[model samples]
Target: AMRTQVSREPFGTLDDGTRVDRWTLESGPAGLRVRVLTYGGIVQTVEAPDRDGMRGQLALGFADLASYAAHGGSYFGALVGRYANRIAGASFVLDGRTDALTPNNGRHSLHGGPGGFSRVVWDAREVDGGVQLHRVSPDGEEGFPGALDVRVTYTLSAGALRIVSCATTDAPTVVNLTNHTYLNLGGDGSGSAAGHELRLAASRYTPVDGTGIPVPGAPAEVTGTRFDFRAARAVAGAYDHNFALDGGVREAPRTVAELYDPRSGRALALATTEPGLQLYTADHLDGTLTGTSGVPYGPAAGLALETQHFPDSPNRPDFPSTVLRPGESYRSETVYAFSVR
Candidate 1:
């Protein structure tokens, strides 16, 4: 059975004055606690135990609402949307209509636009075993066509936090949804992820230019390259690229990646219905803000493995299409399961 409780002080609030509540869900075998604020549908805290039965939050984040209000780029465990990754040239041609977005990353549009879903306040409600966040994006709101209605569900099942996104549009529009959670399997603010070994089931990756935009759909081999995490290796360097995944069990969800931290003997298993995953080591995370444990965040302190459709899919015909038309429903699911050695 699932149990629910409310937090006296919400993790954060948006500019609209909507109070973003935090809900905690617990069960047996393992306890999973997640604090989600309606503002941006941001996930505030995720607490689970390591192999030694020592529990701690595994994602990088601020301690209070004041810090979250100040930090915008960190994103942390927020829900990124309309489009989660980059769009080259800050523009795309959809149905022969050119849609231009705000250039936030060099000359490209990063994570939606100047005001993505991560910056918006969502409508929230309690469900059977989780909280459901809903938001509607108006046509031309972010230079994208159609009025889009999006719903994201956060649930705690077993020892995993399952995040699922569903949406519909009145017209043609692009969409890529994912939770921007920087994982630190060893525990939040503990140390760098260099001691964590990772393995991703991918043979090819999408390389980006200096501006971090993909250089078209070329099947760059991952074998013997820094992109090859198939054999479990420590993470280092500035890695912000998407990998092409092998299609497996079309009807059944399969594990696409595994992260093991020897220091804590804790393992994080990722499964998704999306065809690609973006691996981002926090190369730009300088020790500017302190996290939950009062430790400063620095480069390589955390890593983000976001599963989704390839970036710039709306502009690349050869890539998986991110367009959702009227009368059709868009759905995607990802699971972050935890275990111990």
Candidate 2:
């Protein structure tokens, strides 16, 4: 009988000689296979069955650790944190004290800064039907106020993969964590997801300026804008903005969005407890990097559905607070269910 399995193997070593390991969680009933790397808790690959029961890679990632170390800017399937999206000005005032962070995107901080969680290795262990990665960010790391202890778990169930992120801090600090997985239900390396259909449960979206920061007010309505995805519509054009989900934060995750590929009859339903979701169409990917499929990746190669707290929340007093104080704990969950239409 085919059963769920979890295994680990050495992936490779970094230039500094830090060893990295890869973990695999294959569930027979789910028809899902996921590979994760200890080097940043990266979701190296996600394989799911199509209409004909033919399994294919659905997440974009590198075949080797070397590629990730060099061109990891696109984030791929890495665990993002400290701050998932952008934080304006590369600084935030916490408890009346401004903490300056390391900026990697122009003058702002993107994905927690240069030394953020995505760029660091995490200690991992095999769990029931998945893997759990843990990391402790030292005080002042990335200029965040406290020393944060984070734990992320990736599990495979009947027809879905779930990710749960939890963190605690020693001092008051701001954090937003999520998984950055660029998916192409048409199968990775298929190029352009323009023909894919998307339906987002968002009646409003945060408008961003050139620097990707919210444009000075509450989220704008999506009623008559191209940002509207209330109904399933073909995904096109450049999109790297955040959508404010209609159902704010809740104890349980709710279905928030869906992505479908008519050609392959593969569909993905996303459920999360996050208040915001970032839909990125891989517009920033040039032909400079090649993915595991041996094809050079270009713009629109894949799209990422990142569930998290709103971007620049540290600066926006009106948004849901992302601040985690000494006694409070932070938790979030996101689930991706795949099926043949």
Candidate 3:
């Protein structure tokens, strides 16, 4: 008697003339609505109620498939994969053979080259309490080495949204998957997430260069710097760094982050089984990307808490390995629990 209801409908044809479907998931007596699109497996919108019982959008996304196709580089609410972050110089040695990738991020590979998983239409099916999406990447699709099959399920229970991912490859290849959902718990299209109080369950953070490549080291402690968020402080700086989670990877998900907005009385609690969380403050939005709110998004308009393996894991041997060979499976689980103060 208590299960999420999912409905599907057409969402307009793609640029390639591929027809796409939109899945709307609803649960909870107060009605938490999640709109997911087959194209890019994107979270088009997430609507949850505030303390006053009035619902507000919790994430950012465009209104149409054409807009998403154009601003795909922005990532927005799409599922990113092949490699979720950067690969140094667009090259990495796998099994003693140096393989080169198409450099989409200025001499480096970012989020799986120019045509990543986020830009394609995935096969979708209505599952028990949500939707199941899957896609297959052919070998050498973006200078990658394996024929990979990946599946992600978006399940909503109570007031939380859960994402579980699984992948396998016919050959040994590097894999890292995560949803690049720019969360703005202050409500969608309402600008300036700088006011949101943030708390991360990490004591150390990886330092990066100007191009966002993590320097290979043990990471720096956050206690003495502005990166400290264990005490629940306002996010004050331009943050695009990865936090080395204290517990590393776990078999079960653990609480890793909390983002709350006092004004809206809405909060998002993050728990994941992955070893790292990429905190991006949306420092690059220059007001060019327009969202559903009919407003152009500018810097500091939103932030992303991407839970996944460490950045450049293919090159960072000290980091937990992202390499997956035949007969081995890559799995990740993350949950976004919502609450109202």
Candidate 4:
């Protein structure tokens, strides 16, 4: 039931003549496949079966390289950040040293600055029926300290896609990595994400102010609150929040979120080793963006369940530290298990 096939080809070439390779991972028994590009280590598409045994792309993506290059903010299906979410004032004191960062989100640094991991080309290779993408960011690149050595492996098997990331820094630094895949279980042209049902196994959530930085406060309980999704139900309006995962960070991956389409019965169960999950309702997918299918993608077109450490971990001394000093290594993983009920 875990049978799989892989194929690689050229996705596109940049002005510098640098080539971007695309790898396709195909799984049988349940019939699913996903295409990943070295550029941004982005998942271009994910095709899986619905209840009627029909297959459709559940992940949002653009038509071509030009479109992806031109896309703003909404990361679509790319791997993001040396420091994901946000870092206040674009600076943080690590090990008693103040590191100034490149601020892309107002005065804060977001998704690892303007030229973060999501916008770079990673070296790719095949290993264990999957692809391994690696990159090394020089010290002070995007204003982050240390030369970070990073590797992320994407594996598709047995109705699931597992992502495992590893990294280390030559000097003390901060690191947080996550894939930004917008889930539209109803598929493209299926309309809003409102009809979809979601459940997160989180008891607490981090609150943010107008700038999306986690405001000063303890993790608030989600019980009896709109942020609560302990019971599966449809989502309403816009949502851009982070849930402090139950049990916090773990050495191994554990179930954290479940999302399904009541209409098609297509579902996704997410598990991660990270301490939090950022839920974004595609609030920036205004009518300006159009997909390959010739449809204008508006707000709430898809949803994102990003496994991560709390936002602003670098600046919040009270929170778990993301600092990576010499001799220490960092590791994290997230799994996307697909099914149809």
Each model's RMSD to truth, in Å? 1.9, 1.1, 1.2, 1.2
TM-score of each: 0.95, 0.98, 0.98, 0.97
After best superposition, candidate 2 residue 303: deviation in angstroms? 0.3
Model 2: per-residue Cα lDDT over 1-341, one tens digit each: 24668999999998899999999988874479889999878999999888988888989899999998987788989899889999999988988999998878998999988877888999998888889999999898888888999999998886789999999999999989999999989878898988999999999999999989998999899998999999999997789999999988878999999999999998999999999999999988888888888888889899999998998999999999999999998999999999989
- Evaluate all candidate structures by whole-model CA lDDT and list the values in order: 0.82, 0.91, 0.89, 0.87
Clashes of each: 0, 0, 0, 0
lDDT at position 329, candidate 3: 88
Residue 19 local lDDT, model 3: 94
Which candidate, 1 or 3, would have the higher TM-score against the true structure?
A: 3
- Among the numbered candidates, top lDDT falls to 2
Model 2: which ten-residue window has the lowest total lDDT? 1-10
Supply the TM-score for candidate 3: 0.98
Clashing pairs in 2: none
Candidate 4 lDDT over 241-265, as tens digits, reads 9998889989999998999998889
Q: What global local distance difference test value does model 3 have? A: 0.89
- What are the runs in model 3 whose C-alpha is more than 4 Å off? 28-31
lDDT of 2: 0.91
> Candidate 4 clashing pairs?
none
The worst-scoring run of ten residues by lDDT in candidate 4 lies at 285-294
